[PDB]
Amino acid sequence: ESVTANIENVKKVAHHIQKLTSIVPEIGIICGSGLGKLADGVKDKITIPYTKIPNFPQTSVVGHSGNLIFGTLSGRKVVVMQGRFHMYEGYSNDTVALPIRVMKLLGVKILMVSNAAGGLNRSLKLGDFVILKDHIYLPGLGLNNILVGPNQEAFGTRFPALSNAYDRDLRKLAVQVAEENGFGNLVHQGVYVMNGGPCYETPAECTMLLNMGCDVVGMSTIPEVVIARHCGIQVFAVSLVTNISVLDVESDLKPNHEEVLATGAQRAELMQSWFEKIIEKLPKD
Amino acid sequence: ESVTANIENVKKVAHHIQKLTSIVPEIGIICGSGLGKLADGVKDKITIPYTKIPNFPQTSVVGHSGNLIFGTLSGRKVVVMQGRFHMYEGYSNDTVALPIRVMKLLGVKILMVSNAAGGLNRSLKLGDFVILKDHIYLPGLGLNNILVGPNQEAFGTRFPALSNAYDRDLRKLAVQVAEENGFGNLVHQGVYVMNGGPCYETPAECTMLLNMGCDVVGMSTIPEVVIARHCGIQVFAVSLVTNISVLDVESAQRAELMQSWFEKIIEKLPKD
Amino acid sequence: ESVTANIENVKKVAHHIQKLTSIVPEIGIICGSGLGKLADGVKDKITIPYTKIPNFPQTSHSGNLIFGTLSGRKVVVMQGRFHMYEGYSNDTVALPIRVMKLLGVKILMVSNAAGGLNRSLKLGDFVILKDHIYLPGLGLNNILVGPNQEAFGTRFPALSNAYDRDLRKLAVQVAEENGFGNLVHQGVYVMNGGPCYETPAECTMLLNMGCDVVGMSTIPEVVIARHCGIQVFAVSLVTNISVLDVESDLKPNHEEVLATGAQRAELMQSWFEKIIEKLPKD
């Protein structure tokens, strides 16, 4: 399961990073679908490959290590995670949790995250942005919650509440920014349900999930959100609707992931702009 | 993970405990929520710490380790489990199963369990008692059932049915005792769904669970109930509603009454 | 302890089997409920116990891989399955299906025992799977969790026509012309990891999820088959009628479940034989 995400190990990693950069991040960004360009446009960037950080978890896109990117975005100090640890890859709870807990010790106060999701809600269109206002953590309700195991008291409490998990003030700001900039029609809010994956959802599964009250379904994000809330980081999360879920078996349409990647690539410019304009107006500073 | 909960290992733990006490328990009790007294009220008590028993699972520090308390309660021999093993802590199936199977070998015929739960059913109020009449074992449906692995045939069958899992006669008696003693207005019956935890449930999760047909939600109890039924122990289980679930994102006290209820139920239990 | 179901290891197993038999199978059959007597019908056959195939998983007498001819077609039959409720790993379940693929299997046919949730179902009915709900898979116990084995398939497999519509059609037509079309339905199968039978509250929930039958197997093998491009036909025998009411004295009994399966075994075998008979030949 790699190194335990305890205070000792997390501090060690944080200190290693702090020798490599003088940027003290206020906002952490986990790049998902549509955020590829935002990562590139970080100003005065310093790129730290995961390979160069002892005990930091290792992931690659066909050979190329992920990176931590420090710098600024709209005048605000950020750290960007370029490369994530999805549970369908077989990563441990400790692997997924360590980077978020490292962000806490580095100074991160807000986490912004995107992902690719299937649209269950029948009003959604391809390319829509669905701000998460709540979630259903199917793995968590089973016995695959990321927090299962000894609680690391240094970071949070044994039984965390998830009441305002998707900060209502950050959601209101994100909607306002979209509306002010002429793409409010693309922005929805909804409930995201996690399918552990990596299979796309069958029509019967989608029909069930829609009837549970779910608006979008995806295979990521909730584990990161749980760790973030556990250690008191405010969360803003957006699903890009990269496929419209098929609810009937009598239908030749299907999710193919390349069209999922195409939707991400085509909405990247707008999602970058949105996130930059949100960051510009975030409170505290 | 510690030691396999097979008939040989369970036999050895049971034999060791039988040297430390002459009490042959007829009723096993696991108090979760309202565990104030009961263990206080047992006459002629014998407190056996978990560390005193070899191969018996041990709690993780906390400044207060587990005990197995033997004695009598309202004229019946009992064994109380103080110190539980919950799956959200990372305990293995064998760790949770072994204690219940030890109870079986010691002579336990009835298991009484209390726990703390979130109220999903909209007519519940904080402090209410909800007798479990059925459950939904979400971890079990999802391939984290406590019985996964080789079946221990000496305890039970490969594919146990869970018909009358929460004995209907015990529930009827429990309801009779509550109404007889003036706190019948607190008592409900319902379906308990297990959230593996340890996070509390989001509004959207609570809404989904309510619409699945669940009345309360908690992070324990079902694994123990499944092991109990597998080896033929009758089960009585009750949730104390300690949090009322919020359904949309837009939006100690009963300790003495619960221990008293359990004491009065045991008084009225049939005896062979 | 189990060997990874990667192309290197699967090749080694398939190459060992290919020295023990000349039969190149194009249909793979996994014997579940109602298919106990299927191995008997296989002609020009060779029985290979799992015990004499290195790194092939071991299940219990040992399980066998039977090669031969059924209704004129080359088949491999798995007598002995690896149920997840027994504690078997994903690799253990996946390897046999991937071996089938390297051996040449194009169609996988499978039966299982299931509880009938749909209130119109009768005991002994056949429910062809047209779709499924993989509760373990949704909850992070999907058989494909781990590094994707690219030799076999893609990272994010779609499950759109998982239960091949042409095979389902043919199966329904074969039943109808042989006079048992009234026993045949099509439905959604939900997986309960098991090994407990379902409580009344669980059954009620599953029925309201849109499920017709519930069982403890099959989906993991189906996912692996679809991942490597094998077409799938699957049928649940309704071996118990699910009890939705806690006050009812009715309950699932495993001896009655096995008895129901055995009673239908001749008919289920004949059905499978006649499906294979009518499959398009190239």
GROMACS .gro file of C-alpha atoms in nm, chain C:
model
  282
  558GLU     CA    1  -0.014  -1.652  -0.447
  559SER     CA    2  -0.213  -1.660  -0.775
  560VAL     CA    3  -0.027  -1.570  -1.095
  561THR     CA    4  -0.115  -1.239  -1.262
  562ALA     CA    5  -0.350  -1.286  -1.557
  563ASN     CA    6  -0.111  -1.109  -1.795
  564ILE     CA    7  -0.030  -1.218  -2.150
  565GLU     CA    8   0.299  -1.385  -2.047
  566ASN     CA    9   0.137  -1.612  -1.786
  567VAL     CA   10  -0.180  -1.680  -1.986
  568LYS     CA   11   0.035  -1.778  -2.287
  569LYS     CA   12   0.230  -2.026  -2.073
  570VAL     CA   13  -0.094  -2.190  -1.956
  571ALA     CA   14  -0.247  -2.200  -2.305
  572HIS     CA   15   0.074  -2.344  -2.454
  573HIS     CA   16   0.070  -2.623  -2.196
  574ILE     CA   17  -0.292  -2.706  -2.280
  575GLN     CA   18  -0.213  -2.699  -2.654
  576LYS     CA   19   0.039  -2.983  -2.600
  577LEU     CA   20  -0.231  -3.191  -2.425
  578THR     CA   21  -0.494  -3.149  -2.699
  579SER     CA   22  -0.530  -3.066  -3.070
  580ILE     CA   23  -0.885  -2.929  -3.029
  581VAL     CA   24  -0.906  -2.557  -3.107
  582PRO     CA   25  -1.229  -2.449  -2.933
  583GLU     CA   26  -1.449  -2.170  -3.071
  584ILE     CA   27  -1.715  -2.197  -2.799
  585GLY     CA   28  -1.637  -2.186  -2.428
  586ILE     CA   29  -1.897  -2.306  -2.178
  587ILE     CA   30  -1.894  -2.246  -1.802
  588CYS     CA   31  -2.112  -2.507  -1.630
  589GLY     CA   32  -2.340  -2.361  -1.364
  590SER     CA   33  -2.687  -2.461  -1.245
  591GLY     CA   34  -2.859  -2.695  -1.492
  592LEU     CA   35  -2.540  -2.784  -1.683
  593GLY     CA   36  -2.406  -3.067  -1.464
  594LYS     CA   37  -2.460  -3.328  -1.737
  595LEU     CA   38  -2.319  -3.116  -2.023
  596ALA     CA   39  -1.974  -3.281  -2.019
  597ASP     CA   40  -2.141  -3.618  -2.092
  598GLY     CA   41  -2.275  -3.496  -2.428
  599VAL     CA   42  -1.931  -3.379  -2.544
  600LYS     CA   43  -1.792  -3.620  -2.807
  601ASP     CA   44  -1.437  -3.709  -2.914
  602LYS     CA   45  -1.345  -3.555  -2.580
  603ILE     CA   46  -1.039  -3.524  -2.358
  604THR     CA   47  -1.070  -3.441  -1.988
  605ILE     CA   48  -0.780  -3.235  -1.847
  606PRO     CA   49  -0.792  -3.193  -1.466
  607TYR     CA   50  -0.687  -2.847  -1.342
  608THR     CA   51  -0.426  -3.027  -1.128
  609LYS     CA   52  -0.225  -3.116  -1.443
  610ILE     CA   53  -0.213  -2.759  -1.581
  611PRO     CA   54   0.067  -2.555  -1.417
  612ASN     CA   55  -0.037  -2.212  -1.280
  613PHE     CA   56  -0.403  -2.281  -1.364
  614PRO     CA   57  -0.622  -2.220  -1.056
  615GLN     CA   58  -0.734  -2.517  -0.844
  616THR     CA   59  -1.100  -2.581  -0.748
  617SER     CA   60  -1.301  -2.877  -0.614
  618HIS     CA   61  -1.262  -3.416  -0.706
  619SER     CA   62  -1.061  -3.160  -0.906
  620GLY     CA   63  -1.221  -2.936  -1.167
  621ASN     CA   64  -1.169  -3.029  -1.532
  622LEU     CA   65  -1.121  -2.857  -1.868
  623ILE     CA   66  -1.305  -3.074  -2.122
  624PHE     CA   67  -1.232  -3.030  -2.494
  625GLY     CA   68  -1.439  -3.189  -2.769
  626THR     CA   69  -1.730  -3.155  -3.009
  627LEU     CA   70  -2.085  -3.046  -2.925
  628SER     CA   71  -2.349  -3.026  -3.201
  629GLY     CA   72  -2.068  -3.028  -3.461
  630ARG     CA   73  -1.865  -2.743  -3.304
  631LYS     CA   74  -1.534  -2.741  -3.117
  632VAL     CA   75  -1.588  -2.652  -2.751
  633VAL     CA   76  -1.403  -2.614  -2.422
  634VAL     CA   77  -1.610  -2.675  -2.106
  635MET     CA   78  -1.513  -2.551  -1.760
  636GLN     CA   79  -1.632  -2.800  -1.498
  637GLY     CA   80  -1.544  -2.620  -1.175
  638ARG     CA   81  -1.574  -2.242  -1.126
  639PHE     CA   82  -1.407  -1.985  -0.903
  640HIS     CA   83  -1.669  -1.796  -0.704
  641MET     CA   84  -1.558  -1.476  -0.535
  642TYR     CA   85  -1.744  -1.566  -0.211
  643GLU     CA   86  -1.492  -1.854  -0.173
  644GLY     CA   87  -1.209  -1.600  -0.141
  645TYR     CA   88  -1.064  -1.635  -0.493
  646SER     CA   89  -0.874  -1.339  -0.637
  647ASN     CA   90  -0.952  -1.140  -0.951
  648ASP     CA   91  -0.651  -1.296  -1.126
  649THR     CA   92  -0.776  -1.646  -1.041
  650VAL     CA   93  -1.115  -1.576  -1.199
  651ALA     CA   94  -0.971  -1.386  -1.497
  652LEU     CA   95  -0.699  -1.627  -1.606
  653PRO     CA   96  -0.927  -1.911  -1.728
  654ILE     CA   97  -1.132  -1.672  -1.946
  655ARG     CA   98  -0.817  -1.522  -2.095
  656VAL     CA   99  -0.680  -1.873  -2.156
  657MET     CA  100  -1.002  -1.945  -2.350
  658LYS     CA  101  -0.933  -1.637  -2.565
  659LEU     CA  102  -0.578  -1.752  -2.653
  660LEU     CA  103  -0.712  -2.102  -2.728
  661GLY     CA  104  -0.953  -1.949  -2.983
  662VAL     CA  105  -1.289  -1.905  -2.807
  663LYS     CA  106  -1.521  -1.656  -2.978
  664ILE     CA  107  -1.839  -1.721  -2.776
  665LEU     CA  108  -1.874  -1.785  -2.401
  666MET     CA  109  -2.194  -1.955  -2.279
  667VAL     CA  110  -2.264  -1.962  -1.905
  668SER     CA  111  -2.541  -2.068  -1.668
  669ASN     CA  112  -2.597  -1.990  -1.302
  670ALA     CA  113  -2.845  -2.029  -1.016
  671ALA     CA  114  -3.039  -1.715  -0.921
  672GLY     CA  115  -3.322  -1.593  -0.699
  673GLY     CA  116  -3.627  -1.464  -0.883
  674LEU     CA  117  -3.703  -1.104  -0.783
  675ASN     CA  118  -3.946  -1.032  -1.068
  676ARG     CA  119  -4.287  -1.145  -0.932
  677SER     CA  120  -4.394  -1.294  -1.269
  678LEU     CA  121  -4.113  -1.553  -1.256
  679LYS     CA  122  -4.184  -1.916  -1.163
  680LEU     CA  123  -3.943  -2.165  -1.010
  681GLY     CA  124  -3.743  -2.345  -1.281
  682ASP     CA  125  -3.784  -2.060  -1.531
  683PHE     CA  126  -3.491  -1.962  -1.751
  684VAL     CA  127  -3.394  -1.595  -1.747
  685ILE     CA  128  -3.154  -1.500  -2.024
  686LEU     CA  129  -2.937  -1.213  -1.907
  687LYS     CA  130  -2.987  -0.907  -2.127
  688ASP     CA  131  -2.811  -0.673  -1.879
  689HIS     CA  132  -2.657  -0.663  -1.532
  690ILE     CA  133  -2.592  -0.459  -1.220
  691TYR     CA  134  -2.243  -0.530  -1.088
  692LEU     CA  135  -2.281  -0.416  -0.727
  693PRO     CA  136  -1.924  -0.525  -0.635
  694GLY     CA  137  -1.792  -0.347  -0.946
  695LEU     CA  138  -1.967  -0.020  -0.861
  696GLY     CA  139  -1.825  -0.048  -0.508
  697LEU     CA  140  -1.458  -0.078  -0.615
  698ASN     CA  141  -1.443  -0.460  -0.628
  699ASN     CA  142  -1.455  -0.477  -1.010
  700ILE     CA  143  -1.254  -0.772  -1.140
  701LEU     CA  144  -1.056  -0.535  -1.371
  702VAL     CA  145  -0.921  -0.318  -1.086
  703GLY     CA  146  -0.541  -0.305  -1.119
  704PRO     CA  147  -0.310  -0.236  -1.415
  705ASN     CA  148  -0.487  -0.286  -1.747
  706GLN     CA  149  -0.354  -0.579  -1.948
  707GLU     CA  150  -0.333  -0.415  -2.290
  708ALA     CA  151  -0.277  -0.738  -2.483
  709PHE     CA  152  -0.632  -0.840  -2.386
  710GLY     CA  153  -0.829  -0.515  -2.391
  711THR     CA  154  -0.884  -0.149  -2.316
  712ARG     CA  155  -0.864   0.041  -1.984
  713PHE     CA  156  -1.229   0.153  -1.986
  714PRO     CA  157  -1.439  -0.121  -2.149
  715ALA     CA  158  -1.794  -0.034  -2.251
  716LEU     CA  159  -2.066  -0.283  -2.154
  717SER     CA  160  -2.334  -0.173  -2.405
  718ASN     CA  161  -2.418  -0.501  -2.585
  719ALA     CA  162  -2.255  -0.718  -2.318
  720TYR     CA  163  -2.512  -0.992  -2.362
  721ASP     CA  164  -2.497  -1.033  -2.738
  722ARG     CA  165  -2.841  -0.951  -2.878
  723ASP     CA  166  -2.809  -1.198  -3.168
  724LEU     CA  167  -2.731  -1.487  -2.932
  725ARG     CA  168  -3.026  -1.389  -2.709
  726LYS     CA  169  -3.261  -1.382  -3.011
  727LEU     CA  170  -3.143  -1.725  -3.128
  728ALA     CA  171  -3.179  -1.873  -2.778
  729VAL     CA  172  -3.539  -1.747  -2.755
  730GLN     CA  173  -3.620  -1.883  -3.103
  731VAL     CA  174  -3.468  -2.224  -3.021
  732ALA     CA  175  -3.676  -2.251  -2.702
  733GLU     CA  176  -3.993  -2.143  -2.886
  734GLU     CA  177  -3.963  -2.399  -3.173
  735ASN     CA  178  -3.874  -2.679  -2.925
  736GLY     CA  179  -4.186  -2.609  -2.717
  737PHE     CA  180  -4.046  -2.452  -2.397
  738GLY     CA  181  -4.064  -2.083  -2.494
  739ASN     CA  182  -4.307  -2.028  -2.204
  740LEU     CA  183  -4.025  -2.105  -1.957
  741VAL     CA  184  -3.789  -1.847  -2.112
  742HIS     CA  185  -3.764  -1.481  -2.011
  743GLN     CA  186  -3.505  -1.208  -2.045
  744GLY     CA  187  -3.394  -0.993  -1.754
  745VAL     CA  188  -3.145  -0.790  -1.555
  746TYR     CA  189  -2.916  -0.987  -1.321
  747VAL     CA  190  -2.773  -0.825  -1.009
  748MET     CA  191  -2.470  -0.967  -0.832
  749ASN     CA  192  -2.478  -1.018  -0.457
  750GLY     CA  193  -2.119  -1.094  -0.357
  751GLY     CA  194  -2.258  -1.352  -0.114
  752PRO     CA  195  -2.244  -1.609   0.023
  753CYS     CA  196  -2.552  -1.518   0.233
  754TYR     CA  197  -2.886  -1.535   0.059
  755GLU     CA  198  -3.060  -1.200   0.034
  756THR     CA  199  -3.271  -1.063   0.321
  757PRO     CA  200  -3.631  -0.960   0.250
  758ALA     CA  201  -3.531  -0.590   0.266
  759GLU     CA  202  -3.237  -0.655   0.030
  760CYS     CA  203  -3.464  -0.835  -0.219
  761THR     CA  204  -3.717  -0.551  -0.209
  762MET     CA  205  -3.440  -0.297  -0.277
  763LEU     CA  206  -3.301  -0.506  -0.562
  764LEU     CA  207  -3.644  -0.545  -0.723
  765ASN     CA  208  -3.695  -0.168  -0.707
  766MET     CA  209  -3.346  -0.113  -0.861
  767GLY     CA  210  -3.486  -0.270  -1.180
  768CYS     CA  211  -3.347  -0.622  -1.123
  769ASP     CA  212  -3.522  -0.944  -1.227
  770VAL     CA  213  -3.287  -1.202  -1.075
  771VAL     CA  214  -3.009  -1.199  -0.815
  772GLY     CA  215  -2.712  -1.436  -0.791
  773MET     CA  216  -2.356  -1.460  -0.659
  774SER     CA  217  -2.152  -1.526  -0.973
  775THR     CA  218  -2.108  -1.473  -1.345
  776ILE     CA  219  -2.059  -1.097  -1.380
  777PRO     CA  220  -1.679  -1.105  -1.318
  778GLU     CA  221  -1.630  -1.367  -1.594
  779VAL     CA  222  -1.860  -1.168  -1.825
  780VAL     CA  223  -1.658  -0.849  -1.771
  781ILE     CA  224  -1.331  -1.032  -1.850
  782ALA     CA  225  -1.486  -1.194  -2.159
  783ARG     CA  226  -1.617  -0.861  -2.289
  784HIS     CA  227  -1.286  -0.692  -2.210
  785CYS     CA  228  -1.104  -0.936  -2.445
  786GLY     CA  229  -1.379  -0.936  -2.709
  787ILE     CA  230  -1.551  -1.270  -2.648
  788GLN     CA  231  -1.926  -1.266  -2.716
  789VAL     CA  232  -2.137  -1.369  -2.418
  790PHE     CA  233  -2.455  -1.567  -2.368
  791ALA     CA  234  -2.565  -1.613  -2.006
  792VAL     CA  235  -2.875  -1.770  -1.846
  793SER     CA  236  -2.995  -1.774  -1.487
  794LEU     CA  237  -3.200  -2.069  -1.372
  795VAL     CA  238  -3.459  -1.946  -1.121
  796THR     CA  239  -3.369  -2.178  -0.833
  797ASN     CA  240  -3.546  -1.980  -0.561
  798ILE     CA  241  -3.832  -1.731  -0.552
  799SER     CA  242  -3.706  -1.434  -0.352
  800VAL     CA  243  -3.896  -1.362  -0.031
  801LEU     CA  244  -3.969  -0.989   0.004
  802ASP     CA  245  -4.166  -1.011   0.328
  803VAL     CA  246  -3.999  -1.044   0.670
  804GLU     CA  247  -4.317  -1.195   0.821
  805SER     CA  248  -4.316  -1.484   0.570
  806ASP     CA  249  -4.200  -1.834   0.674
  807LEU     CA  250  -4.080  -1.901   0.318
  808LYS     CA  251  -3.698  -1.896   0.276
  809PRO     CA  252  -3.420  -1.999   0.036
  810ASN     CA  253  -3.277  -2.344   0.106
  811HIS     CA  254  -2.963  -2.453  -0.076
  812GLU     CA  255  -3.070  -2.819  -0.110
  813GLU     CA  256  -3.393  -2.705  -0.282
  814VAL     CA  257  -3.182  -2.475  -0.502
  815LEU     CA  258  -2.960  -2.765  -0.612
  816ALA     CA  259  -3.267  -2.987  -0.661
  817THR     CA  260  -3.428  -2.730  -0.892
  818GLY     CA  261  -3.110  -2.704  -1.098
  819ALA     CA  262  -3.074  -3.079  -1.131
  820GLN     CA  263  -3.439  -3.117  -1.237
  821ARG     CA  264  -3.390  -2.872  -1.525
  822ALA     CA  265  -3.048  -3.009  -1.624
  823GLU     CA  266  -3.168  -3.223  -1.917
  824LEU     CA  267  -3.370  -2.938  -2.067
  825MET     CA  268  -3.094  -2.680  -2.013
  826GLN     CA  269  -2.843  -2.914  -2.178
  827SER     CA  270  -3.071  -2.977  -2.475
  828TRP     CA  271  -3.128  -2.603  -2.510
  829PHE     CA  272  -2.756  -2.524  -2.513
  830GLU     CA  273  -2.690  -2.808  -2.761
  831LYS     CA  274  -2.959  -2.679  -2.997
  832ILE     CA  275  -2.832  -2.320  -2.972
  833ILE     CA  276  -2.481  -2.431  -3.070
  834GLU     CA  277  -2.640  -2.635  -3.352
  835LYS     CA  278  -2.793  -2.322  -3.510
  836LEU     CA  279  -2.493  -2.088  -3.464
  837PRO     CA  280  -2.369  -1.946  -3.798
  838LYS     CA  281  -2.071  -2.141  -3.937
  839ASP     CA  282  -1.794  -1.986  -4.147
   0.00000   0.00000   0.00000
